[PDB]
Ligand binder design. Structure first.
Ligand SMILES: Nc1ncnc2c1ncn2[C@@H]1O[C@H](COP(=O)(O)OP(=O)(O)NP(=O)(O)O)[C@@H](O)[C@H]1O
Ligand SMILES: Nc1ncnc2c1ncn2[C@@H]1O[C@H](COP(=O)(O)OP(=O)(O)NP(=O)(O)O)[C@@H](O)[C@H]1O
Ligand SMILES: Nc1ncnc2c1ncn2[C@@H]1O[C@H](COP(=O)(O)OP(=O)(O)NP(=O)(O)O)[C@@H](O)[C@H]1O
Ligand SMILES: [Mg+2]
Ligand SMILES: [Mg+2]
Ligand SMILES: [Mg+2]
Lengths: 473, 597, 139
DNA sequence: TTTTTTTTTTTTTTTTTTTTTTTTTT
DNA sequence: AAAA
């Protein structure tokens, strides 16, 4: 009967072995059956195939009764004597065996036996591999072509991980879409900066390898940073987006034999964001290099073995203060595009000051939990992704947003210690006394730690201390 | 009208349905509800819902002629509101008390009859499960927890052995003991009915060689009857019935909407003014609760008068008491709130502990709890360790800090995340890391002033400072209106008394309703000049830069260095740093004489 | 089971219905001054603390230990030279109350300042349900 | 300093079931 | 008395 039930429901169930070595059950969800919200047309994990138990205890009885009536018809026909005794014994044995189908231990044994028949090798590792398929609230969405195609019928793609947001085509006539666009315009005054920020945010849906980049942008109170960041992170969903701990970025090495359990928060996550900060946390200029590089990183989670996965996420950090970078190598400064907010909200806006507006607390307290606004925002995101795809090729380091590069260059000029001393207390012989003066000045001001690189006789001297400067001993 | 013939269970639904009074077909608001229920139960048999709509209930002349289009668009009903057939059964039980049981005993006897007839006397671990689910399908529910093991929830009814204040609420059971008793107590009479039916059919002489059949059948059923009381058989039946009772999407919907409170005599709803107590069935899923009964706020109660006078004796101001009560009243709400936090200090024995402890105990353990001050006074711990005493904030509504020390600096990094309408992530002991929606009203108690080293608008947007005025002494002196005599009965008793807790809960819900009707809902709308005047005075202090400028004062490089002597010799010593003063003083009053060169 | 609901305190040496599980191994008898042990203890108590008013409060303070409900915000500390009997009296109280109701607490809880939020500690967990505690500091 | 212990690591499974089962029909 |  395990063989028969596999022949009956072979196209709806599949079994594979997980990492720990325990068989698990997956079933295809179809319309017209009880289910969790927004998990239609997708594979669903099943600890015990209770649907299979119900099927074997309900529908199999029809086939069993059909066999009973077939035996009855064969017995009723005129026949010999020995044949009739054989058929009577057959019917007796068959009914005694039929009585067993409703037993519990027998059903468990049948499930155990059918675990082998339903098994399909290379299924767990093939789940959610291609980053062009997204599980949405009403099916699965494909961004393989332009425009994106929504699949709401039967398919065979192994999709298990989804979000609870339905998808509709981008329509600017929707009241929610117009309200959201107006609020977005009010948040970011400059056109080029707004376009660049939307282009950067729109890549969060794509879960493949991306260009090594990161956005830092700060401001005062009531700037809308948390509103937009939380809106993105929540419209993507828990599975695809998550919040990250600032200590995971600002701290030092974690000991090699200690499991992290927080680094895995981005394992397969397409988007992550940092919320808070103190006065001045020195940026680690490491433990971020791998999380930004389109490469592979390794770590160990709770009570598991050492494992490695590929870095695929979009990162953005919000702050009320500037970070401390204390490095000048081209590797770190290739990334870290920097922005500064200009709009400011206070309950009593000052006239004749365009950089000042009134709050609408209904943006935070409500308008976020409402599904329709989230659907409109998802439409905005997918439209922006397809726009970035149709032009500019696919690379994001091609859009002309001179404000962002100018601000990044200005931030680079600050926080850089190479010219600060040469401008304030240039002395004018291997600059040993000069480097000691550098260190004593920066201490308790720019760099509280004594300089240990002897790098002032290197690309540092090639920066501003050249020409007249001499280094012969 | 032929789809009802596809299955008798829909015919039993119709038998329940015709018991419904015809008055339902009129006054539409409580007519569309049954349509909602029948639609959300399953869309396959929706034509039965249309059949009921056109069934000619009451009269066709009430505007329902040739069916109404309010039904056609109701076929979508793509919302989240949930009403099930349990409400229909409860309504059918409301009318005709002597008809529901006698009409469901058909079905009860039926299903068992077909099962015992098709498979002779043999009974296994699914037929019993199906019949049991047919009997009590409303009192129990099963869903999978996070760890992947099935759990059992039982609805609680009046007149039942139960814990205090668990009425009309779901309870968590490791094993359905009530069901283990029901399967062996009330099923027995059903089996006895089956046996007496068999005996009655045996008594009537039908024909030869078939009364023999009603001897093998009787012997088999007699053998199978005793299997109910067997322990292993009951365990198998429970295991198999776990699937029938399963209800998908139930764990994540438990205690979600912040407008429902579980109280000692039901569930409290604050969706509509005035708040309505629920004491009849209902369908909303509530598991957590408080052991405090709820009564409407009546000032004539002696305890209410005493408590109001005690409140009057603690906060001399009138605007200040209103603001404090309004802020505290948000503790009942468990949704997104304004990013605000109140911290207030004063002399010893001022009753702040009394008020905070009273609020915490009135709300209960599930909704409110105390929090350690180390979350404020210490730096953030590294990401590898699993943090407890922080996820204690998960799902709560109110938390208070009472411990205090000498002059200490607030870590204004937890403050920006632990007072915020956003999302926070953490991880508890022996568990993975997850993020939980954050809702909590917080207040801080101390007798020594905190230290705030920042000046940005991000932190000062929140925070509100107050100073206690009255003072209790063992031997109060004459005059001194800010001095009064203690009543140790306020702490050592008057707070374990349930009636006082009920009165305080009534006061709190009344203040919530008052804040709801006027001032809209926002707390940054009530005008209490004293609180922000005191907050601004506090912000005038703790701002070392402006005080230094006023008290004592070429090149901008001479700044910071000149401030260092004041920073060390005065206003603490500490260690001197820069790269923040060069920006703050730049964006400050020191500009006219500032030497940019 | 000893009940102090109403004066005089009653001893329930027969069947009852209260849910009592924890206990001490000390039998209870009415206070009789004529018992030789009682006389010896009273004489030693009078020897240890001479002043009558000071002695009275001390005994009352000790009496409060039996109770396990909310008490007053009072803490007693008394100093002196060596060989004064403070350890004798405090240990006697701790032993007569028993382990379930009395315990000795480390002074490190008062000498140190505080452990951070994520430090699982003994953290006066001995105070969970215990009605008495003593330190005996020596530095 | 402080350093690492704690957290983890196991440790929580077995007791039914099964078996048999005498009887009961053959 | 042997098989279920
Ligand atoms: N476009 C907008 N128009 C009006 N009000 C807005 C707009 N965007 C946001 N708000 C409101 O402004 C307030 C500030 O929200 P929030 O994002 O928390 O401030 P923030 O500065 O980004 N976070 P923080 O920097 O930590 O203070 C909220 O009440 C929002 O509802
Ligand atoms: N309205 C009141 N009238 C009279 N006595 C009161 C009143 N409110 C409180 N008390 C008493 O005053 C004392 C102060 O108790 P408490 O709540 O601990 O104040 P407190 O300031 O929080 N304690 P502390 O942390 O040391 O300042 C208690 O004995 C209360 O019973
Ligand atoms: N009432 C008493 N009459 C006579 N001798 C007594 C009495 N009480 C105690 N002693 C004796 O005096 C000794 C000193 O008591 P003890 O408790 O050791 O002092 P202590 O201060 O608590 N311990 P230490 O701090 O090391 O001196 C006891 O060991 C007894 O032998
Ligand atoms: Mg924000
Ligand atoms: Mg107090
Ligand atoms: Mg001693």
């Amino acid at each position: 009967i395990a063989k028969v039930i596999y022949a009956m429901m072979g196209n709806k169930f599949v079994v594979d072995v997980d990492s720990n070595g325990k068989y698990v059950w997956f079933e295809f969800v179809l319309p017209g059956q009880p289910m969790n919200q927004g998990e239609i047309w997708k594979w669903r994990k099943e600890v015990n195939p209770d649907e299979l138990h119900i099927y074997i205890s309900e529908n199999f009885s029809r086939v069993m009764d059909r066999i009973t009536e077939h035996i009855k018809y064969h017995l009723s026909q005129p026949h010999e004597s020995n044949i009739l005794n054989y058929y009577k014994k057959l019917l007796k044995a068959f009914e005694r065996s039929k009585s067993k189908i409703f037993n519990d231990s027998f059903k468990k044994g049948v499930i155990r036996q059918a675990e082998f028949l339903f098994r399909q090798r290379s299924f767990i590792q093939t789940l959610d591999t291609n980053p062009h398929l997204l599980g949405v609230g009403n099916g699965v969405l494909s961004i393989e072509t332009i425009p994106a195609k929504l699949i709401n019928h039967f398919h065979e793609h192994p999709i298990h991980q989804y979000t609870h947001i339905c998808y509709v085509p981008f329509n600017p006539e929707n009241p929610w879409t117009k309200l959201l666009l107006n609020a977005l315009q009010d948040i970011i005054p400059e056109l080029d900066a707004r376009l660049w920020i939307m282009f950067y945010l729109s890549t969060a849906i794509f879960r493949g390898l991306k260009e090594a980049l990161m956005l830092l942008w700060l401001g005062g109170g009531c700037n809308g940073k948390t509103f937009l960041m939380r809106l993105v992170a929540m419209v993507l969903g828990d599975h695809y987006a998550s919040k990250l701990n600032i200590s995971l970025l600002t701290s030092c090495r974690e000991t090699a034999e200690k499991p992290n359990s927080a680094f895995m928060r981005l394992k397969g996550r397409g988007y992550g964001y940092f919320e808070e900060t103190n006065k001045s946390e020195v940026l680690n200029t490491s433990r971020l290099k791998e999380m930004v590089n389109p490469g592979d990183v390794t770590a160990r989670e709770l009570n598991q073995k050492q494992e490695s996965f590929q870095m695929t996420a979009t990162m953005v950090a919000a702050s009320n203060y500037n970070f401390i970078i204390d490095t000048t190598d081209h590797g770190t400064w290739r990334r870290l595009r920097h922005y500064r907010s200009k709009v400011k909200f206070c309950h009593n806006p000052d006239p004749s000051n365009p950089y000042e507006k009134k709050e609408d607390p209904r943006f935070i307290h409500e308008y976020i939990m409402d599904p329709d606004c989230q659907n409109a925002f998802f439409s905005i995101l997918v439209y922006f992704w397809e726009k970035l795809q149709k032009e500019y090729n696919g690379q994001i380091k091609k859009v002309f947003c001179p404000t962002i590069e100018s601000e990044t260059e200005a931030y680079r000029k600050s926080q850089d210690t190479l010219h600060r001393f040469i401008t304030e207390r240039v002395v004018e012989y291997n600059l040993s006394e000069v480097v000691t003066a550098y260190a004593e000045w920066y201490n308790t001001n720019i760099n509280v730690k004594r300089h240990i690189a002897l790098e002032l006789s290197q690309e540092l001297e090639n920066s501003v201390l050249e020409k007249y400067l001499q280094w012969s001993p | 009208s032929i789809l009802m013939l596809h299955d008798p269970e829909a015919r039993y639904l119709h038998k329940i349905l015709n018991l419904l009074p015809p008055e339902y077909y009129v006054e539409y608001p409580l007519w569309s509800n049954v349509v909602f229920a029948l639609a959300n139960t399953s869309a396959n048999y929706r034509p039965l819902a249309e059949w009921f709509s056109q069934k000619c209930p009451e009269k066709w002349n009430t505007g329902g002629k040739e069916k109404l289009e309010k039904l056609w668009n109701d076929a979508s009903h793509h919302t989240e509101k949930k009403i099930t057939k349990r409400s229909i059964m409860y309504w059918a039980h409301k009318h005709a008390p002597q008809q529901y049981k006698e009409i469901v005993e058909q079905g009860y006897f039926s299903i068992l009859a077909e099962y015992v007839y098709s498979y002779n006397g043999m009974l296994e671990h699914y037929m019993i499960a199906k019949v049991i689910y047919a009997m009590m399908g409303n009192k129990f529910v099963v869903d999978v927890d996070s760890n992947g093991k099935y759990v059992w929830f039982e609805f609680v009814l009046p007149g039942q052995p139960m814990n205090q204040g668990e009425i009309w609420k779901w309870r968590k059971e490791v094993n359905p003991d009530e069901l283990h008793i029901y399967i062996s107590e009330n099923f027995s009479r059903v089996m006895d009915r089956i046996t007496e039916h068999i005996k009655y059919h045996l008594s009537q002489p039908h024909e030869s060689n078939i009364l023999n059949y009603y001897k093998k059948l009787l012997k088999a059923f007699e053998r199978s009857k005793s299997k109910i009381f067997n322990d292993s058989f009951k365990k198998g039946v429970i295991r198999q019935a776990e699937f029938l009772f399963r209800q998908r999407s139930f764990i994540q919907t438990l205690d979600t909407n912040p407008h429902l409170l579980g109280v000692g005599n039901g569930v409290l709803s604050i969706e509509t003014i005035p708040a309505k107590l629920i004491n009849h069935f209902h369908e909303h899923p509530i598991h957590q609760y408080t052991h405090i009964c709820y009564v409407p706020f009546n000032p004539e109660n002696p305890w209410t008068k005493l408590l109001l006078n005690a409140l009057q004796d603690i906060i001399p101001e009138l605007d200040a008491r209103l603001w404090i009560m309004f802020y505290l009243s948000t503790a009942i709400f468990r949704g997104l709130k304004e990013a605000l936090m109140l911290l207030w200090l004063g002399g010893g024995c001022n009753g702040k502990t009394f008020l905070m402890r009273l609020v915490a105990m009135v709300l209960g353990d599930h909704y409110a709890s105390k929090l350690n001050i180390s979350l404020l006074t210490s730096c953030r711990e590294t990401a590898e360790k699993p943090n407890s005493a922080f996820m204690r904030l998960k799902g709560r509504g109110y938390g208070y800090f009472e411990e205090t020390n000498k002059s200490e600096v607030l870590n204004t990094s937890r403050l920006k995340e632990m007072v915020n309408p956003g999302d926070v992530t953490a991880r508890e002991l022996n568990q993975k890391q997850e993020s939980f929606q954050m809702t909590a009203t917080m207040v801080a108690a101390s007798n020594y002033n905190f230290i705030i080293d920042t000046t940005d608008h991000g932190t000062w947007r929140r925070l509100r400072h107050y100073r206690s005025k009255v003072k209790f002494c063992h031997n109060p002196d004459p005059s001194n209106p800010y001095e009064k005599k203690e009543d140790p009965r306020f702490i050592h008793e008057y707070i374990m008394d349930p009636d006082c807790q009920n009165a305080f809960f009534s006061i709190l819900v009344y203040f919530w309703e008052k804040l709801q009707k006027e001032y809209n809902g926002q707390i940054k709308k009530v005008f209490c000049p004293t609180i922000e005047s005191e907050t601004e005075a506090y912000r005038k202090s703790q701002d070392t830069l402006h005080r230094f400028i006023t008290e004592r004062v070429y090149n901008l490089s001479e700044v910071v260095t000149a401030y260092a002597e004041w920073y060390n010799t005065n206003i603490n010593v500490k260690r001197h740093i820069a790269l923040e003063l060069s920006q703050e003083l730049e964006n400050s009053v020191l500009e006219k004489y500032l030497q940019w060169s």
